[PDB]
Amino acid sequence: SGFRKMAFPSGKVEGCMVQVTCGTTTLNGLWLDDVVYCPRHVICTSEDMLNPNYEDLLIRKSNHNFLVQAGNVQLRVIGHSMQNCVLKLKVDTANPKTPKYKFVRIQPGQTFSVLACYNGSPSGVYQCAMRPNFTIKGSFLNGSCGSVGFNIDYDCVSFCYMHHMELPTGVHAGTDLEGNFYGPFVDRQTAQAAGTDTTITVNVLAWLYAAVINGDRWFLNRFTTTLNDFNLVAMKYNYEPLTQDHVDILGPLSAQTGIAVLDMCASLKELLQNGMNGRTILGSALLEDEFTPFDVVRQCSGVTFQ
Amino acid sequence: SGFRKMAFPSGKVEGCMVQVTCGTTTLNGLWLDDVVYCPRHVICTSEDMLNPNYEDLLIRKSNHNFLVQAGNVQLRVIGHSMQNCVLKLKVDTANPKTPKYKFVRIQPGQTFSVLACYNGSPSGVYQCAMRPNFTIKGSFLNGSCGSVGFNIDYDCVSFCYMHHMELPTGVHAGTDLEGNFYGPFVDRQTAQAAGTDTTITVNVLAWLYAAVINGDRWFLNRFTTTLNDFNLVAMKYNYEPLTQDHVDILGPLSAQTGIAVLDMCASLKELLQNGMNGRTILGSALLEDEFTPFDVVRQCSGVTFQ
Numbered sequence: 001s002g003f004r005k006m007a008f009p010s011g012k013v014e015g016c017m018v019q020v021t022c023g024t025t026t027l028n029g030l031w032l033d034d035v036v037y038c039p040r041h042v043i044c045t046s047e048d049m050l051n052p053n054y055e056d057l058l059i060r061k062s063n064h065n066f067l068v069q070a071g072n073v074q075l076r077v078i079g080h081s082m083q084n085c086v087l088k089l090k091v092d093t094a095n096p097k098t099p100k101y102k103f104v105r106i107q108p109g110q111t112f113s114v115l116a117c118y119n120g121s122p123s124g125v126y127q128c129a130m131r132p133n134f135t136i137k138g139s140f141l142n143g144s145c146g147s148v149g150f151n152i153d154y155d156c157v158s159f160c161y162m163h164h165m166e167l168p169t170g171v172h173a174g175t176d177l178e179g180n181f182y183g184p185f186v187d188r189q190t191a192q193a194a195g196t197d198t199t200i201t202v203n204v205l206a207w208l209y210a211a212v213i214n215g216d217r218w219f220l221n222r223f224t225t226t227l228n229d230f231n232l233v234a235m236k237y238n239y240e241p242l243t244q245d246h247v248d249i250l251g252p253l254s255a256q257t258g259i260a261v262l263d264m265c266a267s268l269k270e271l272l273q274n275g276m277n278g279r280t281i282l283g284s285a286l287l288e289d290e291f292t293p294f295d296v297v298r299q300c301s302g303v304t305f306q
Numbered sequence: 307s308g309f310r311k312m313a314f315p316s317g318k319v320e321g322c323m324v325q326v327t328c329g330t331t332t333l334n335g336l337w338l339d340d341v342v343y344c345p346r347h348v349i350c351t352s353e354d355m356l357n358p359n360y361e362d363l364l365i366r367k368s369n370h371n372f373l374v375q376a377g378n379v380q381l382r383v384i385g386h387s388m389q390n391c392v393l394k395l396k397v398d399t400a401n402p403k404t405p406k407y408k409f410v411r412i413q414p415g416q417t418f419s420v421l422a423c424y425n426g427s428p429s430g431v432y433q434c435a436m437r438p439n440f441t442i443k444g445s446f447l448n449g450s451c452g453s454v455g456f457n458i459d460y461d462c463v464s465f466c467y468m469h470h471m472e473l474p475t476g477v478h479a480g481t482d483l484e485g486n487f488y489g490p491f492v493d494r495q496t497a498q499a500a501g502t503d504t505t506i507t508v509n510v511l512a513w514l515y516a517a518v519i520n521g522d523r524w525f526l527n528r529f530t531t532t533l534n535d536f537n538l539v540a541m542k543y544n545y546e547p548l549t550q551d552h553v554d555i556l557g558p559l560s561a562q563t564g565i566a567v568l569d570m571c572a573s574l575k576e577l578l579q580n581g582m583n584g585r586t587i588l589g590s591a592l593l594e595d596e597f598t599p600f601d602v603v604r605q606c607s608g609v610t611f612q
């Protein structure tokens with residue numbers, strides 16, 4: 001038993017991390033087969049980053065302007081091209097540690113693991129959710145751009161995120177691995193604001209089911225509610241509306257615990273209207289919304305990856 | 307910016323994880339050079355695990371009773387011996403992925419990363435603290451024994467923990483890598499209770515400094531307090547006493563923020579006596595105590611590992 005925010009083992013990604021330097025900018029790249037992927041603002045200087053024209057900037061660059069460091073082994077760049085907001089640096093060596101991988105784009109509400117990196121060297125690993133407003137609440141300092149987010153399915157790494165920037169509220173924005181930003185953001189050093197967020201309702205319910213499975217039961221009750229009446233309360237407390245597909249996704253967790261989904265909604269309603277009265281749930285005094293139903297099933301059942 | 311519970315990159319440990327099967331028991335082993343380390347209760351059956359005599363049980367075993375699986379490659383056991391509560395299985399192949407390592411024993415209050423494993427395959431990674439009562443609040447299911455806890459210093463892995471068992475309260479107990487239990491526990495399936503816990507005071511203060519560095523300032527105040535007067539309040543709220551060495555350890559974080567250690571103690575005093583009044587600190591509605599001063603400095607400064 002126990003429930004703990006859990007990242008995927010990072011080994012398969014650690015072997016893809018390299019350092020990319022151009023001029024005065026150093027950041028991380030992702031080395032798969034004979035291509036290194038990295039944020040395109042590596043071609044910029046400081047007075048470039050205020051209002052850059054990246055096509056213009058790139059045509060003035062040379063293969064030899066890009067210094068790629070794979071540990072203490074230098075990789076010669078033999079081609080370069082821009083794909084949306086990422087650079088693709090074609091190198092003369094295929095990464096012998098390339099895992100099976102896919103480039104996927106995730107949905108708000110979904111989680112992934114982040115391998116934070118500096119100077120091409122992994123620093124730590126942690127779990128993040130994509131917020132409804134397409135930001136993530138990460139931990140990123142200068143030099144961390146090019147760190148990636150990912151999920152692992154047996155032996156296949158599904159890369160979903162590359163880090164590019166921090167917004168004024170301290171939250172983080174980036175792209176998928178095809179270089180397309182999550183949310184209405186641009187890779188320019190200007191005033192951009194996140195947009196209003198909401199709480200991921202289906203995830204809170206998943207986490208309540210994780211709590212029951214682990215023996216926290218105090219918030220349960222005999223009451224029930226209809227889906228429509230629950231959603232009237234959700235809107236009040238800035239929670240996302242619950243759909244029948246969410247109810248279906250929660251089916252297995254309902255069946256394991258014997259607590260009907262709409263019954264757990266009645267529990268959530270009471271928690272929203274009353275607070276917790278000084279009690280905790282799975283060691284938290286807040287309703288947690290960054291665990292998906294799959295995250296709960298994986299951890300409360302123990303799936304691995306080889 | 308941002309502050310997030312962060313594990314070390316797990317790659318160096320992933321390459322040491324193997325599967326050990328004896329009779330009907332399967333668990334994980336740690337393969338370093340030509341030795342596999344694993345919990346000694348792998349030699350047990352169910353009616354062994356109630357009150358086992360492990361010397362007796364081991365003399366009845368054979369090298370060939372131990373099936374060691376390194377992925378899909380079987381390792382022949384050529385010797386076996388017991389060291390306290392761990393088994394050392396001498397195998398005919400040295401692990402070519404053996405990192406530089408040390409076996410260290412940690413202190414309550416210290417943190418480490420856990421690579422949870424099943425059937426020799428890594429499942430997830432997360433950060434844990436050793437509680438003052440020598441338990442850890444982990445996430446472990448059946449088959450997870452032999453998973454290890456560790457810290458990484460540049461390129462050296464300091465193994466500090468091997469998982470053995472879950473207590474009735476849902477917390478977890480295990481040994482150092484020399485097989486000596488943390489706390490007053492034995493590897494027997496009997497009634498053992500954790501012992502009363504306390505809150506790690508120096509870590510809470512470190513986390514308050516992480517909050518200030520990240521812009522949470524509402525809990526600050528002009529008040530101050532003496533170390534003695536703070537400790538009168540700590541004892542009331544079941545917090546550990548603060549020592550001058552804790553104050554010294556917090557010195558660098560004090561200097562960075564310009565907030566004297568004893569001033570932050572006055573803030574903690576107020577938080578203990580008043581609660582939070584519906585506010586949060588670093589996304590938490592509880593005072594968090596599983597970040598060390600070193601964890602805060604590493605993350606709020608960005609140290610890596612190669």
Ligand SMILES: *[C@H](O)[C@H](C[C@@H]1CCNC1=O)NC(=O)[C@@H]1[C@@H]2[C@H](CN1C(=O)OC(c1ccc(F)cc1)c1ccc(F)cc1)C2(C)C
Pocket residue numbers: 027041049140141142143144145146164165166167168172186187188189190191192307
């Ligand atoms: C890449 O390593 C870097 C990662 C940032 C640095 C701090 N935390 C991170 O996640 N990315 C950037 O520096 C990008 C890059 C420039 C600007 N930028 C950025 O993150 O935004 C900064 C900013 C400055 C002023 C504003 F009005 C808005 C945003 C920024 C924010 C915090 C901070 F500590 C430093 C810089 C661009 C987008 C090309």
Ligand SMILES: *[C@H](O)[C@H](C[C@@H]1CCNC1=O)NC(=O)[C@@H]1[C@@H]2[C@H](CN1C(=O)OC(c1ccc(F)cc1)c1ccc(F)cc1)C2(C)C
Pocket residue numbers: 001333347355446447448449450451452470471472473474478492493494495496497498
């Ligand atoms: C090894 O994989 C296993 C890991 C445990 C299983 C569940 N969570 C874990 O961390 N370790 C054990 O099974 C050890 C092993 C037997 C008993 N044991 C154990 O964890 O304690 C169990 C227990 C049963 C009855 C009690 F009165 C106390 C303890 C236990 C607790 C929870 C659970 F789901 C299953 C079993 C020993 C110590 C040799």
